[PDB]
Homo-oligomer: A and B are copies of this chain.
C-alpha cells in the first residue's frame, strides 16, 4: 500500500497473508471458516514450495497469540480462467481445516448482487505490500481509503484503454494506491467485500493508471457452489 497508514491492531479479522515458504506473497480474504479468496496470478508466481495462509496477524515478524498458519489443501479456479485472463482472475483456497474464529479471525460477507458500486464511494484496501516504489516492505498491516472510479473514465485511452470489463472495477491511484504484494487482498465498501486486488504488473501511484479490482458479485454463483 502506497500513501497508506498502519491499520489498527486486528480491526480487519478477515485479512489473510498468503505465504510462500514462510514469506508474505499476496494478500487474501477469509470468506468462510475453511476458505480464503485470493488472486490466481498469485499462486502462479508461488516460486516452488509450501503455500500457507496466515490468519489473525498484524505484524508479520512478531509473535501474536491470534496468529495461526494453515496449509492449503487445494486452489479452485472459476470457469473462464485461461492463459490470457489470469491477471484479473480469482482463486478459492481451501485450508487444511476450519479456521479457529475469534475477535482477530472472522470471515467477511461478500456482495452477491451484481450491481456496480457507485462512483466516488470510499472503499478500504489493506495489505502488507510495498510501501514505496523502491520496494520497502512493511511489517505491520497497512491500509488506505480509495474512492471508486467509474468504469467509463477508467477505460479512457489515457487510462486503461477499454481493458476494464464488466467483471472489473477501478479505484483512483492518485498517490494513494495498492501495489506489489497487495494483490489478492480485499476492497471493502460499507463493511462488505466488493473487490479483490488484482494489480498484476501495473505501475503504482500513477493517477493515469488506476487500480484494478475484480468484482466478487460477478462470481457470486461460483463462490456459492464451491463453498456449499
Contacts and interface: CB of A to CB of B under 8 A. Distances in A.
Nearest to A114: B33
A134 interface: no
Nearest to A227: B112
A190 B111 CA distance: 14
- A contact face: mostly helix, strand, loop, or mixed: loop
Nearest to A228: B224
Contact of A115 (B106, B112, B113, B191): B106
Copies in the complex: 2
Interface residues of A, number: 16
Contacts of A103: 118
A110 B190 CA distance: 13
A101 B115 CA distance: 9
A160 to B, nearest CB: 25
Interface in A75-134: 101, 103, 106-107, 109-113, 115, 118
B192 A113 contact: no
